[PDB]
Design an enzyme around this catalytic site. Sequence first.
Site, PDB file in Angstrom:
ATOM      1  N   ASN A 100      38.507  38.619  44.118  1.00 41.60           N
ATOM      2  CA  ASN A 100      37.431  37.456  44.412  1.00 41.60           C
ATOM      3  C   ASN A 100      37.820  37.166  45.703  1.00 41.60           C
ATOM      4  OD1 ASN A 100      36.136  35.134  44.742  1.00 41.60           O
ATOM      5  ND2 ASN A 100      35.976  34.698  42.685  1.00 41.60           N
TER       6      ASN A 100
ATOM      7  N   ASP B 295      38.959  31.198  43.282  1.00 39.13           N
ATOM      8  CA  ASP B 295      37.696  31.815  43.760  1.00 39.13           C
ATOM      9  C   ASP B 295      38.196  32.229  45.081  1.00 39.13           C
ATOM     10  OD1 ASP B 295      35.062  31.654  45.203  1.00 39.13           O
ATOM     11  OD2 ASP B 295      34.701  31.906  42.870  1.00 39.13           O
TER      12      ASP B 295
END
Length: 322
Positions: free
Chosen positions: A181, A232
């Site tokens: 990510n 993230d």
Amino acid sequence: QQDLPTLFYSGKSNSAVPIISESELQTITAEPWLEISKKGLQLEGLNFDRQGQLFLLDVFEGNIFKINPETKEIKRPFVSHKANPAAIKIHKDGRLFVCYLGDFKSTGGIFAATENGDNLQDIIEDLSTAYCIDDMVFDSKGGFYFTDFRGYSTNPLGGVYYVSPDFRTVTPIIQNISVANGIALSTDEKVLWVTETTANRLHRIALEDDGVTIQPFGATIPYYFTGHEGPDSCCIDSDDNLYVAMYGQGRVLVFNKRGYPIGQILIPGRDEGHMLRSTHPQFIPGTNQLIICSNDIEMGGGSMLYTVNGFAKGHQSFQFQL
């Protein structure tokens, strides 16, 4: 950089290898900075241009916004022609590189364009490749590393790849990652940081001088995140600290250059389940003011940009070099 909550080099935050739990991390709560919409938009891809103007987008609709951090005026230059764009990285020549996921299985890629959506060029085609690109980071030579956002917990189809400055060669850096990510390069570009969302892990990769070969036993896991969903997007600061947005957790965690946690930034309303979709951290050029985007889609509540002051000034990434 006004009088916003700030992260200081105090206590365990100033140690090289602090032994500490998340609950004891120096913590601050971000303040509202600029509401993008009353509507729920999946904000992502923060990135400033050489002029200090803020660019971002929303994944689901593909809108691309340009914001004046000074006047806080919001503009909508254009819309992505590719499905599910996830990140925007500005080239030194001013172009906007947009990573997109496509169908989440193989139709992803990267395209470049002008600040206005003109000169649409394919850097990495969507149908000829099996990538679902979620993010990327430029090295000082114009080449870049991108994350292959594929698979899940026990199906590590993802990985990190390097694209040469001429965009002709793509070589794998590290594979077998359950949904790569976030990604970032240390200031000296010898260390590559990668977040693995579905396994809640932080990757620290020591690279050889060629920038594509991993040093012996150089790919490690300095940290195991916790909580749904997982790590993230991320960015570094000039002191080589790593700022990681925690998707679904309404927070951002900060690590020092060695990968130890030293700070925590909370998004307002997280305890009640609001604004849990904190997806991206980014510094206002030349300053230590951090911008964080999140949205309250899960509870019908709009899209907001929050802010705080980080440990140091943002890093002079590619778009700021010359």
